[PDB]
Amino acid sequence: IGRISTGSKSLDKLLGGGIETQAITEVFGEFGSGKTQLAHTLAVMVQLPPEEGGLNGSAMYIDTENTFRPERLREIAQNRGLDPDEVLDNVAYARAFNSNHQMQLLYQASAMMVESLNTDRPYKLLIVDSLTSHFRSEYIGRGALAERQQKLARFLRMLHRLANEFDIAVFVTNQTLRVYLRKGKRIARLIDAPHLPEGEAVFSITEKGIED
């Protein structure tokens, strides 16, 4: 049950130290609420030692909405005193053009995690940006809802299996642990957290990604 720091101390106290492994943390909010910025920040933070809030790991980023920015990871790494090239080498990225491809990527991810095991930098984080984007776009009409819901549910079950088997933290953005983001100082609110206390945290988006 390792924990990855968000880059923000107040957001970390709200999450009980940061996002947990063997779990799926879902951040929901409108465009610009900080979801994608929090994903880019986590992709850097995971690579740090546990004293510095990371897990000496690598990160996987599934991009469904054309939001992944390597130059953003470079900026966050540089402004946090890390080598940007090494950070970029430790983040695996794949763009999903439709729901089917999105699920297919989870089997390819499973394979890379097995390989990452026995290394000094195993994969510890899997990010899925806009988890429902394709499902909503491809399934319009009450008739397609059954397949839409079942396909999403199947994807989430696979994410849980990947998390529980490879001891990885799963982080998903949407327009188990649910966090609502809303609008420089953004606000984060826990949604009926099962073990953590009800509450809110104020955070900023900077050249260091997410921070107090």
Partner: peptide
Amino acid sequence: KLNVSCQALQKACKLFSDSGFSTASGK
């Protein structure tokens, strides 16, 4: 580009029956 062998992909499908990835650098 991060290649996964057909064999590795088969093991993955087996494990969860009971275009790909690239490093951010562009490999």
